[PDB]
Amino acid sequence: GSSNEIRRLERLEHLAEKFRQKASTHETWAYGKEQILLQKDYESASLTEVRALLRKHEAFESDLAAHQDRVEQIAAIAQELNELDYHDAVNVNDRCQKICDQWDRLGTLTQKRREALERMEKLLETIDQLHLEFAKRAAPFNNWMEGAMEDLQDMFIVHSIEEIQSLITAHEQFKATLPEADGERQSIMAIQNEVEKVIQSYNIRISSSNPYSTVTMDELRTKWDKVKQLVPIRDQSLQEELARQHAN
Amino acid sequence: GSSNEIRRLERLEHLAEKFRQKASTHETWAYGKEQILLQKDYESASLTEVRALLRKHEAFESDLAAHQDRVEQIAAIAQELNELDYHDAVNVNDRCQKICDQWDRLGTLTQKRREALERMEKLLETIDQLHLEFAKRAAPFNNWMEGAMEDLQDMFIVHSIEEIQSLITAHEQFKATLPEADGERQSIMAIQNEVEKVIQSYNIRISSSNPYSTVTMDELRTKWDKVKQLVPIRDQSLQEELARQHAN
């Protein structure tokens, strides 16, 4: 009936004024965030980088969880103004609704960016763990093959029927390895597939060369061929030596 | 007295021939390795990269430990040929000596490259562990300062002498934080020094910006100033409100 009802109607005005402040605020804080969340900056990234992202994404997710409160306040005020029949309620309700709707999407997008990151980290991690292996087992292998190429081509010096008869032996014990060793040589090859394959699964533009190993798998086969090709040339020479110790 | 002594003298010839083979081999394997070991490819590297190096340096150190044997064989033969007075012994001895001398240096260099790497890894690691921290504690901070800038600027709506008398309170309980909170704000600043300092210790051409945090320390101070500058503007407004609740 005036005054006492006027003050009561001005409160409502004050409330909305309180509503526009907070709304205005939140609206400016959520500007562009969507675009920032729908961005694709991790498809080429490294295990390192991606790990940087999850870390910065936790920052963003902490800023987020903080504003959940501002959003409920905004909603509460628009709710009161609707119930007290503020005269411009459809408008404030609409601004509040457009805000709350956006909130739900930020939620989705955000959870989405985390999932794309947590999986890019696993691919990247996985790839790494393969590479490491390849190199771990590929080093000893490179060794053995060098320790065999030089051995199978080592000039011998025998002047008895018995010296040349221990070599033919030691060298016979080494062949029994050729197979088993070729078992390992199969594996290394395998590990090399599991990598180029996983890489090939997602983005095929990433590099395959192993940053942990210089011996590549190509050159690792080349060596094995020579190892295989020497085995026979040795046999001959060792035969021919026997054919001189029992020949004198 | 011929023949039986001839065969004995031909053995020596055969032995040296055996010596030139192995020498020739080792010599070609150690070509350029020195240069490869005196190279400086880690001063700009990342924690990641360097870690790649130690891994490839273990490969090189495994190839090394393997040839120690070839070196002792070479030495043994030159030793025999000296004792049996081979006629070209000074020469083989000299080739063996030049090889053994090189071996000792590869040893030094190699141990040296490992040490430069193990320490570059620690600097790099260290830097990283600092950066992480800065960002870890710098995120919550950024929050609080936003959660305070918006609070100290939040329009109030009171119509009694008691409502405006709880705010003045809640807001009085918040100030007791300003100091302690400034304690944290000091720390974050510190962690930020420990990094730029360590970085500045070795190579000063590396970047300082934190890959784990977007909030820089500069902009982190800017916010604290506003937080400090609002505290007073609030006081006023809250005073003036009391000067209207006890004024009506």
Short mmCIF file of C-alpha atoms in Angstrom, two decimals:
data_model
loop_
_atom_site.label_atom_id
_atom_site.label_comp_id
_atom_site.label_asym_id
_atom_site.label_seq_id
_atom_site.Cartn_x
_atom_site.Cartn_y
_atom_site.Cartn_z
CA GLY A 1 0.00 0.00 0.00
CA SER A 2 3.04 2.16 -0.62
CA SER A 3 6.31 2.75 1.22
CA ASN A 4 6.44 -0.45 3.25
CA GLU A 5 5.47 -2.20 0.01
CA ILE A 6 7.66 0.17 -1.98
CA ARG A 7 10.76 -0.77 0.02
CA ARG A 8 9.79 -4.37 -0.50
CA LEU A 9 9.59 -3.76 -4.28
CA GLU A 10 12.92 -1.89 -4.33
CA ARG A 11 14.56 -4.87 -2.62
CA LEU A 12 13.63 -6.87 -5.75
CA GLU A 13 15.24 -4.14 -7.88
CA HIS A 14 18.31 -4.29 -5.69
CA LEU A 15 18.35 -8.10 -5.97
CA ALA A 16 18.32 -8.07 -9.77
CA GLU A 17 21.03 -5.37 -9.69
CA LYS A 18 22.84 -7.94 -7.58
CA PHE A 19 21.95 -10.43 -10.25
CA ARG A 20 23.41 -8.45 -13.19
CA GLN A 21 26.69 -7.97 -11.36
CA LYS A 22 27.38 -11.65 -10.79
CA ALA A 23 25.96 -12.60 -14.20
CA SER A 24 28.14 -10.02 -15.90
CA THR A 25 31.13 -11.39 -14.03
CA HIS A 26 30.61 -15.11 -14.81
CA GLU A 27 29.81 -14.29 -18.44
CA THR A 28 33.17 -12.57 -18.94
CA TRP A 29 35.02 -15.41 -17.18
CA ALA A 30 33.49 -18.01 -19.45
CA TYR A 31 34.23 -16.12 -22.63
CA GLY A 32 36.23 -18.13 -25.13
CA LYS A 33 36.70 -21.00 -22.68
CA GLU A 34 34.61 -23.20 -24.92
CA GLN A 35 36.90 -22.55 -27.88
CA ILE A 36 39.86 -23.17 -25.61
CA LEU A 37 38.30 -26.53 -24.66
CA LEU A 38 37.38 -27.62 -28.18
CA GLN A 39 40.93 -26.87 -29.38
CA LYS A 40 43.09 -29.70 -30.76
CA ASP A 41 46.68 -29.03 -29.55
CA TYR A 42 47.66 -32.52 -28.54
CA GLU A 43 47.51 -34.64 -31.70
CA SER A 44 51.18 -33.93 -32.47
CA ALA A 45 52.37 -33.44 -28.87
CA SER A 46 54.96 -35.57 -27.06
CA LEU A 47 54.64 -37.73 -23.92
CA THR A 48 56.21 -34.79 -22.14
CA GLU A 49 54.00 -32.03 -23.56
CA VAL A 50 50.74 -33.96 -23.08
CA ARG A 51 51.76 -34.46 -19.50
CA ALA A 52 52.08 -30.69 -19.32
CA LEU A 53 48.54 -30.36 -20.50
CA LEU A 54 46.90 -32.66 -17.99
CA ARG A 55 48.73 -30.48 -15.42
CA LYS A 56 47.39 -27.26 -16.88
CA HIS A 57 44.02 -28.94 -17.34
CA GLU A 58 43.90 -29.54 -13.60
CA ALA A 59 44.38 -25.83 -13.15
CA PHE A 60 41.43 -25.12 -15.42
CA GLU A 61 39.40 -27.82 -13.65
CA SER A 62 40.13 -26.20 -10.28
CA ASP A 63 39.08 -22.73 -11.50
CA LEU A 64 35.95 -24.45 -12.77
CA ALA A 65 34.89 -26.27 -9.63
CA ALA A 66 35.28 -22.91 -7.92
CA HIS A 67 32.73 -21.06 -9.99
CA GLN A 68 30.09 -23.77 -9.50
CA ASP A 69 29.13 -21.66 -6.48
CA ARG A 70 28.77 -18.40 -8.46
CA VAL A 71 26.51 -20.34 -10.81
CA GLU A 72 24.24 -21.61 -8.05
CA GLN A 73 24.06 -18.11 -6.54
CA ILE A 74 23.06 -16.65 -9.90
CA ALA A 75 20.40 -19.35 -10.22
CA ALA A 76 19.10 -18.74 -6.71
CA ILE A 77 18.57 -15.04 -7.25
CA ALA A 78 16.81 -15.58 -10.62
CA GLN A 79 14.76 -18.14 -8.80
CA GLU A 80 13.71 -15.70 -6.09
CA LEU A 81 12.97 -12.90 -8.53
CA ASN A 82 10.68 -15.35 -10.43
CA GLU A 83 8.83 -16.32 -7.29
CA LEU A 84 8.45 -12.78 -6.04
CA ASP A 85 7.19 -11.94 -9.51
CA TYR A 86 9.87 -9.40 -10.31
CA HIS A 87 8.53 -7.44 -13.30
CA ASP A 88 11.56 -8.21 -15.53
CA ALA A 89 11.76 -11.85 -14.49
CA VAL A 90 11.49 -13.48 -17.88
CA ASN A 91 14.60 -11.54 -18.85
CA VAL A 92 16.70 -12.41 -15.79
CA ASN A 93 15.42 -15.97 -15.98
CA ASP A 94 16.58 -16.12 -19.61
CA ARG A 95 20.01 -14.75 -18.82
CA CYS A 96 20.30 -17.23 -15.93
CA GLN A 97 19.18 -20.10 -18.19
CA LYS A 98 21.64 -19.23 -20.96
CA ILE A 99 24.34 -19.27 -18.24
CA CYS A 100 23.33 -22.55 -16.69
CA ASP A 101 23.05 -24.18 -20.12
CA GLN A 102 26.59 -23.05 -20.87
CA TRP A 103 27.74 -24.38 -17.56
CA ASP A 104 26.53 -27.86 -18.43
CA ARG A 105 28.43 -27.80 -21.73
CA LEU A 106 31.67 -26.56 -20.14
CA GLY A 107 31.19 -29.60 -17.98
CA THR A 108 30.92 -31.89 -20.98
CA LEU A 109 33.71 -30.29 -22.96
CA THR A 110 35.99 -30.27 -19.97
CA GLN A 111 35.48 -33.94 -19.21
CA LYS A 112 36.03 -34.52 -22.89
CA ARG A 113 39.39 -32.73 -23.10
CA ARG A 114 40.59 -34.74 -20.12
CA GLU A 115 39.66 -38.00 -21.79
CA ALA A 116 41.33 -37.08 -25.05
CA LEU A 117 44.45 -36.22 -22.99
CA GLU A 118 44.42 -39.29 -20.77
CA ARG A 119 44.29 -41.45 -23.83
CA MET A 120 46.90 -39.52 -25.81
CA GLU A 121 49.14 -39.93 -22.80
CA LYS A 122 48.62 -43.69 -22.86
CA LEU A 123 49.36 -43.95 -26.57
CA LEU A 124 52.39 -41.81 -26.15
CA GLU A 125 53.44 -43.62 -22.98
CA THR A 126 52.85 -47.02 -24.60
CA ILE A 127 54.92 -46.12 -27.67
CA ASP A 128 57.73 -45.00 -25.41
CA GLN A 129 57.70 -48.22 -23.37
CA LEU A 130 57.97 -50.17 -26.62
CA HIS A 131 60.90 -48.10 -27.99
CA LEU A 132 62.76 -48.51 -24.71
CA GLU A 133 62.43 -52.25 -24.94
CA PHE A 134 63.49 -52.50 -28.53
CA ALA A 135 66.67 -50.62 -27.65
CA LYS A 136 67.22 -52.51 -24.36
CA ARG A 137 67.28 -55.87 -26.08
CA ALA A 138 68.61 -54.51 -29.36
CA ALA A 139 71.91 -53.42 -27.82
CA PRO A 140 73.08 -56.77 -26.50
CA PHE A 141 72.04 -58.23 -29.85
CA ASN A 142 74.11 -55.77 -31.87
CA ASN A 143 76.98 -56.84 -29.61
CA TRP A 144 76.69 -60.60 -30.10
CA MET A 145 76.50 -60.10 -33.84
CA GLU A 146 79.70 -58.05 -33.82
CA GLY A 147 81.24 -60.49 -31.36
CA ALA A 148 80.45 -63.15 -33.91
CA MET A 149 81.25 -61.42 -37.17
CA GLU A 150 84.76 -60.73 -35.94
CA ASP A 151 85.06 -64.22 -34.45
CA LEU A 152 83.93 -66.18 -37.51
CA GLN A 153 86.50 -64.16 -39.49
CA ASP A 154 89.41 -64.59 -37.08
CA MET A 155 92.56 -66.03 -38.60
CA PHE A 156 93.50 -69.23 -36.81
CA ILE A 157 96.98 -70.57 -36.17
CA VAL A 158 97.26 -74.29 -35.55
CA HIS A 159 100.18 -76.69 -36.15
CA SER A 160 98.81 -79.89 -34.58
CA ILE A 161 95.88 -82.25 -35.18
CA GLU A 162 94.52 -81.31 -31.77
CA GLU A 163 94.50 -77.51 -31.76
CA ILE A 164 92.48 -77.36 -34.96
CA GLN A 165 90.25 -79.97 -33.26
CA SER A 166 89.09 -77.73 -30.42
CA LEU A 167 88.20 -74.85 -32.66
CA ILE A 168 86.07 -77.00 -34.90
CA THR A 169 84.46 -77.79 -31.56
CA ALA A 170 84.09 -74.41 -29.88
CA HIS A 171 82.73 -73.30 -33.26
CA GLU A 172 80.32 -76.21 -33.27
CA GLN A 173 79.00 -75.16 -29.84
CA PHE A 174 78.39 -71.63 -31.20
CA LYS A 175 76.14 -72.79 -34.05
CA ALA A 176 73.71 -74.36 -31.56
CA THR A 177 73.11 -70.72 -30.72
CA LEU A 178 72.30 -69.51 -34.24
CA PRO A 179 68.76 -70.81 -33.87
CA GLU A 180 67.94 -69.64 -30.33
CA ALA A 181 69.70 -66.38 -31.08
CA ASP A 182 67.48 -66.15 -34.17
CA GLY A 183 64.63 -66.59 -31.73
CA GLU A 184 65.68 -63.32 -30.09
CA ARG A 185 66.26 -61.75 -33.46
CA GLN A 186 62.63 -62.59 -34.22
CA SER A 187 61.41 -60.93 -31.03
CA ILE A 188 63.31 -57.67 -31.48
CA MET A 189 61.68 -57.55 -34.93
CA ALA A 190 58.32 -58.08 -33.28
CA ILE A 191 58.74 -55.28 -30.68
CA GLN A 192 59.61 -53.14 -33.64
CA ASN A 193 56.19 -53.95 -35.16
CA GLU A 194 54.14 -53.38 -32.03
CA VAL A 195 55.53 -49.81 -32.13
CA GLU A 196 55.16 -48.82 -35.77
CA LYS A 197 51.68 -50.34 -35.40
CA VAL A 198 50.50 -48.39 -32.36
CA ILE A 199 51.98 -45.26 -33.88
CA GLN A 200 50.11 -46.08 -37.07
CA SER A 201 46.90 -46.50 -35.10
CA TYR A 202 46.37 -42.81 -34.18
CA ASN A 203 48.24 -40.10 -36.07
CA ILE A 204 50.48 -41.59 -38.78
CA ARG A 205 52.53 -38.38 -39.14
CA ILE A 206 54.64 -39.03 -36.04
CA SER A 207 58.20 -40.36 -36.34
CA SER A 208 59.16 -43.99 -35.82
CA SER A 209 62.96 -43.78 -35.37
CA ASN A 210 63.90 -44.77 -31.82
CA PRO A 211 65.40 -41.89 -29.75
CA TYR A 212 66.79 -44.40 -27.29
CA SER A 213 68.62 -46.58 -29.87
CA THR A 214 70.96 -45.72 -32.76
CA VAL A 215 71.08 -49.24 -34.07
CA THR A 216 68.02 -49.35 -36.26
CA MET A 217 66.22 -52.60 -37.02
CA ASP A 218 67.16 -52.38 -40.72
CA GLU A 219 70.90 -52.33 -40.04
CA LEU A 220 70.23 -54.89 -37.32
CA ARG A 221 69.11 -57.37 -39.96
CA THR A 222 72.00 -56.57 -42.29
CA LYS A 223 74.37 -57.71 -39.58
CA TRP A 224 72.47 -60.94 -39.00
CA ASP A 225 72.78 -61.78 -42.72
CA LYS A 226 76.57 -61.43 -42.60
CA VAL A 227 76.58 -63.55 -39.45
CA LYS A 228 74.61 -66.16 -41.43
CA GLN A 229 76.82 -65.82 -44.53
CA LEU A 230 80.05 -66.25 -42.57
CA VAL A 231 79.06 -69.44 -40.77
CA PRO A 232 79.63 -71.36 -44.06
CA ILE A 233 82.88 -69.69 -45.13
CA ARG A 234 84.29 -70.66 -41.72
CA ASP A 235 83.26 -74.33 -42.04
CA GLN A 236 85.29 -74.58 -45.24
CA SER A 237 88.46 -73.07 -43.78
CA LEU A 238 88.18 -75.14 -40.63
CA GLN A 239 87.60 -78.25 -42.75
CA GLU A 240 90.60 -77.53 -44.94
CA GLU A 241 92.76 -77.12 -41.81
CA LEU A 242 91.84 -80.55 -40.57
CA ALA A 243 92.67 -81.71 -44.10
CA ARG A 244 96.28 -80.72 -43.33
CA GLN A 245 96.72 -81.80 -39.72
CA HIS A 246 95.74 -85.34 -40.58
CA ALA A 247 97.56 -84.68 -43.83
CA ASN A 248 100.92 -84.26 -42.03
CA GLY B 1 119.16 -74.99 -38.13
CA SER B 2 116.58 -74.70 -40.88
CA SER B 3 113.14 -76.20 -41.48
CA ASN B 4 112.24 -77.07 -37.89
CA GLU B 5 113.54 -73.59 -37.03
CA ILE B 6 112.06 -72.20 -40.23
CA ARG B 7 108.56 -73.38 -39.31
CA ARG B 8 109.14 -71.87 -35.91
CA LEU B 9 110.08 -68.54 -37.56
CA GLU B 10 107.08 -68.66 -39.91
CA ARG B 11 104.79 -69.10 -36.91
CA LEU B 12 106.00 -65.65 -35.78
CA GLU B 13 105.15 -64.31 -39.25
CA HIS B 14 101.75 -65.93 -39.01
CA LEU B 15 101.27 -64.45 -35.53
CA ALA B 16 101.97 -60.89 -36.66
CA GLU B 17 99.67 -61.47 -39.65
CA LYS B 18 97.20 -62.41 -36.94
CA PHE B 19 98.21 -59.22 -35.23
CA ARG B 20 97.57 -56.90 -38.21
CA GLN B 21 94.10 -58.35 -38.71
CA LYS B 22 92.86 -57.63 -35.21
CA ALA B 23 94.72 -54.31 -35.06
CA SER B 24 93.23 -53.25 -38.37
CA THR B 25 89.81 -54.18 -37.07
CA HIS B 26 89.97 -52.33 -33.71
CA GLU B 27 91.50 -49.29 -35.40
CA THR B 28 88.53 -48.93 -37.76
CA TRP B 29 86.05 -49.44 -34.91
CA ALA B 30 87.62 -46.69 -32.86
CA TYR B 31 87.70 -44.20 -35.69
CA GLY B 32 85.94 -40.96 -34.89
CA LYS B 33 84.67 -42.29 -31.56
CA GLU B 34 86.82 -39.75 -29.79
CA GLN B 35 85.20 -36.89 -31.67
CA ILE B 36 81.83 -38.44 -30.95
CA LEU B 37 82.75 -38.46 -27.24
CA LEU B 38 84.13 -34.93 -27.08
CA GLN B 39 80.97 -33.58 -28.76
CA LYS B 40 78.75 -31.11 -26.89
CA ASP B 41 75.12 -31.99 -27.81
CA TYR B 42 73.53 -31.71 -24.40
CA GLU B 43 73.96 -28.08 -23.31
CA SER B 44 70.61 -27.12 -24.86
CA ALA B 45 68.88 -30.51 -24.47
CA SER B 46 65.76 -31.19 -22.39
CA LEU B 47 65.23 -33.50 -19.39
CA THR B 48 63.77 -35.90 -21.91
CA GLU B 49 66.52 -35.73 -24.53
CA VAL B 50 69.38 -35.98 -22.00
CA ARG B 51 67.67 -39.06 -20.66
CA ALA B 52 67.82 -40.38 -24.20
CA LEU B 53 71.53 -39.84 -24.23
CA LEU B 54 72.38 -41.67 -21.04
CA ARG B 55 70.43 -44.55 -22.66
CA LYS B 56 72.40 -44.37 -25.88
CA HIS B 57 75.55 -43.84 -23.84
CA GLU B 58 74.93 -47.18 -22.16
CA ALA B 59 74.87 -48.72 -25.59
CA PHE B 60 78.24 -47.19 -26.40
CA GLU B 61 79.55 -48.26 -22.99
CA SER B 62 78.45 -51.84 -23.65
CA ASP B 63 80.14 -51.93 -27.08
CA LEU B 64 83.20 -50.59 -25.28
CA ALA B 65 83.45 -53.10 -22.46
CA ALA B 66 83.20 -55.73 -25.19
CA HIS B 67 86.29 -54.70 -27.08
CA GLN B 68 88.43 -54.64 -23.92
CA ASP B 69 89.09 -58.27 -24.85
CA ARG B 70 90.22 -57.49 -28.43
CA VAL B 71 92.59 -54.96 -26.90
CA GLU B 72 94.15 -57.45 -24.49
CA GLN B 73 94.51 -59.99 -27.31
CA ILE B 74 96.27 -57.43 -29.48
CA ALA B 75 98.58 -56.62 -26.57
CA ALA B 76 99.30 -60.27 -25.88
CA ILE B 77 100.39 -61.01 -29.42
CA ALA B 78 102.63 -57.90 -29.58
CA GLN B 79 103.99 -59.06 -26.28
CA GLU B 80 104.84 -62.52 -27.60
CA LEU B 81 106.35 -61.21 -30.81
CA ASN B 82 108.61 -58.94 -28.67
CA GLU B 83 109.74 -61.82 -26.50
CA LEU B 84 110.34 -64.17 -29.39
CA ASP B 85 112.29 -61.33 -30.98
CA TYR B 86 110.14 -61.05 -34.07
CA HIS B 87 112.24 -59.03 -36.55
CA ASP B 88 109.58 -56.31 -37.03
CA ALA B 89 108.73 -56.10 -33.33
CA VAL B 90 109.38 -52.43 -32.75
CA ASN B 91 106.77 -51.74 -35.41
CA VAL B 92 104.07 -54.06 -34.06
CA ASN B 93 104.89 -52.92 -30.55
CA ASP B 94 104.39 -49.31 -31.67
CA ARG B 95 101.08 -50.05 -33.34
CA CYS B 96 99.95 -51.94 -30.22
CA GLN B 97 101.08 -49.05 -27.99
CA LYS B 98 99.28 -46.40 -30.05
CA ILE B 99 96.16 -48.60 -29.70
CA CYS B 100 96.45 -49.14 -25.98
CA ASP B 101 97.12 -45.44 -25.41
CA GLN B 102 93.95 -44.63 -27.31
CA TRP B 103 92.07 -47.18 -25.30
CA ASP B 104 92.96 -45.41 -22.07
CA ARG B 105 91.70 -42.09 -23.43
CA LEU B 106 88.41 -43.55 -24.71
CA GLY B 107 88.10 -44.68 -21.13
CA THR B 108 88.60 -41.17 -19.81
CA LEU B 109 86.44 -39.46 -22.39
CA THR B 110 83.68 -41.98 -21.94
CA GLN B 111 83.58 -41.60 -18.17
CA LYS B 112 83.62 -37.88 -18.80
CA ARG B 113 80.61 -37.81 -21.14
CA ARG B 114 78.64 -39.83 -18.60
CA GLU B 115 79.43 -37.35 -15.85
CA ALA B 116 78.50 -34.35 -17.97
CA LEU B 117 75.21 -36.16 -18.73
CA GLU B 118 74.44 -37.28 -15.19
CA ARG B 119 74.84 -33.73 -14.03
CA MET B 120 72.89 -32.15 -16.89
CA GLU B 121 70.11 -34.56 -16.02
CA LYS B 122 70.15 -33.37 -12.42
CA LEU B 123 70.05 -29.72 -13.39
CA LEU B 124 67.30 -30.40 -15.81
CA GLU B 125 65.47 -32.66 -13.37
CA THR B 126 65.90 -30.14 -10.55
CA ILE B 127 64.54 -27.28 -12.66
CA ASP B 128 61.55 -29.39 -13.55
CA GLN B 129 60.80 -30.29 -9.92
CA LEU B 130 60.86 -26.58 -9.09
CA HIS B 131 58.51 -25.57 -11.95
CA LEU B 132 56.06 -28.29 -10.94
CA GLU B 133 55.94 -26.92 -7.43
CA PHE B 134 55.51 -23.34 -8.44
CA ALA B 135 52.49 -24.35 -10.51
CA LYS B 136 51.13 -26.76 -7.87
CA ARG B 137 50.94 -24.08 -5.22
CA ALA B 138 50.40 -21.26 -7.70
CA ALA B 139 47.05 -22.63 -8.86
CA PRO B 140 45.24 -22.65 -5.53
CA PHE B 141 46.67 -19.17 -4.96
CA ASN B 142 45.32 -17.79 -8.23
CA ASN B 143 41.98 -19.20 -7.07
CA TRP B 144 41.87 -17.58 -3.63
CA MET B 145 42.78 -14.26 -5.16
CA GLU B 146 39.92 -14.51 -7.65
CA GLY B 147 37.67 -15.85 -4.90
CA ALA B 148 38.55 -12.72 -3.02
CA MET B 149 38.56 -10.10 -5.75
CA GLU B 150 35.01 -11.02 -6.66
CA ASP B 151 34.01 -11.27 -2.99
CA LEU B 152 35.40 -7.92 -1.84
CA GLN B 153 33.50 -6.37 -4.78
CA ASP B 154 30.18 -8.12 -4.19
CA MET B 155 27.19 -5.83 -3.84
CA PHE B 156 25.55 -6.37 -0.47
CA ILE B 157 21.86 -6.10 0.35
CA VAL B 158 21.00 -5.47 3.99
CA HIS B 159 17.95 -3.76 5.55
CA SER B 160 18.59 -4.41 9.25
CA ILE B 161 21.25 -3.47 11.81
CA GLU B 162 22.10 -7.14 12.17
CA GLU B 163 22.61 -8.36 8.61
CA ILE B 164 25.17 -5.67 7.89
CA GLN B 165 26.70 -6.72 11.23
CA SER B 166 27.62 -10.25 10.17
CA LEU B 167 29.25 -9.17 6.96
CA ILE B 168 31.45 -6.66 8.71
CA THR B 169 32.32 -9.76 10.71
CA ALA B 170 32.82 -12.46 8.10
CA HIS B 171 34.89 -9.80 6.31
CA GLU B 172 36.87 -9.18 9.46
CA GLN B 173 37.69 -12.91 9.71
CA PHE B 174 38.98 -12.83 6.11
CA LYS B 175 41.53 -10.07 6.76
CA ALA B 176 43.26 -12.23 9.39
CA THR B 177 44.16 -14.25 6.33
CA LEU B 178 45.74 -11.43 4.31
CA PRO B 179 48.96 -11.82 6.26
CA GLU B 180 49.28 -15.63 6.35
CA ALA B 181 48.11 -15.73 2.75
CA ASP B 182 50.85 -13.19 2.02
CA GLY B 183 53.15 -15.71 3.66
CA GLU B 184 52.25 -18.15 0.88
CA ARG B 185 52.49 -15.41 -1.68
CA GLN B 186 56.06 -14.90 -0.48
CA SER B 187 56.90 -18.58 -0.88
CA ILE B 188 55.54 -18.94 -4.41
CA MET B 189 57.76 -15.95 -5.25
CA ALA B 190 60.68 -17.76 -3.68
CA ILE B 191 60.17 -21.05 -5.62
CA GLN B 192 60.12 -18.83 -8.65
CA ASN B 193 63.63 -17.59 -7.73
CA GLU B 194 65.14 -20.97 -6.98
CA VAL B 195 64.26 -21.84 -10.61
CA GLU B 196 65.40 -18.78 -12.54
CA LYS B 197 68.53 -19.09 -10.38
CA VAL B 198 69.39 -22.72 -11.12
CA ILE B 199 68.63 -22.09 -14.76
CA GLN B 200 70.91 -19.07 -14.60
CA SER B 201 73.63 -21.21 -13.06
CA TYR B 202 74.46 -23.31 -16.16
CA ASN B 203 73.32 -22.15 -19.59
CA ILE B 204 71.43 -18.85 -19.38
CA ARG B 205 69.91 -19.26 -22.87
CA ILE B 206 67.22 -21.70 -21.72
CA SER B 207 63.62 -20.53 -21.20
CA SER B 208 62.13 -19.75 -17.80
CA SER B 209 58.37 -19.75 -18.54
CA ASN B 210 56.69 -22.64 -16.74
CA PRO B 211 55.23 -25.31 -19.10
CA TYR B 212 53.11 -26.64 -16.27
CA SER B 213 51.50 -23.29 -15.30
CA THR B 214 49.85 -20.55 -17.37
CA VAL B 215 49.51 -18.19 -14.47
CA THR B 216 52.87 -16.49 -14.47
CA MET B 217 54.34 -14.97 -11.32
CA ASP B 218 54.10 -11.45 -12.78
CA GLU B 219 50.35 -11.62 -13.29
CA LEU B 220 50.18 -13.45 -9.96
CA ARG B 221 51.43 -10.32 -8.21
CA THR B 222 49.13 -8.02 -10.17
CA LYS B 223 46.19 -9.89 -8.71
CA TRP B 224 47.52 -9.66 -5.18
CA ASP B 225 47.76 -5.86 -5.52
CA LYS B 226 44.09 -5.60 -6.49
CA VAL B 227 43.25 -7.88 -3.58
CA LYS B 228 45.19 -5.44 -1.36
CA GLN B 229 43.63 -2.36 -2.98
CA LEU B 230 40.07 -3.65 -2.57
CA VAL B 231 40.30 -4.45 1.13
CA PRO B 232 40.09 -0.68 1.86
CA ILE B 233 37.32 0.21 -0.60
CA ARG B 234 35.22 -2.50 1.07
CA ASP B 235 35.80 -1.16 4.60
CA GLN B 236 34.36 2.19 3.53
CA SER B 237 31.20 0.74 1.98
CA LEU B 238 30.65 -1.59 4.91
CA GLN B 239 31.19 1.31 7.30
CA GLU B 240 28.75 3.52 5.45
CA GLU B 241 26.14 0.73 5.60
CA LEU B 242 26.37 0.54 9.36
CA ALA B 243 26.03 4.33 9.26
CA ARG B 244 22.51 3.75 7.91
CA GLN B 245 21.29 0.76 9.91
CA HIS B 246 21.95 2.57 13.16
CA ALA B 247 20.83 5.65 11.26
CA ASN B 248 17.29 4.26 10.80
#
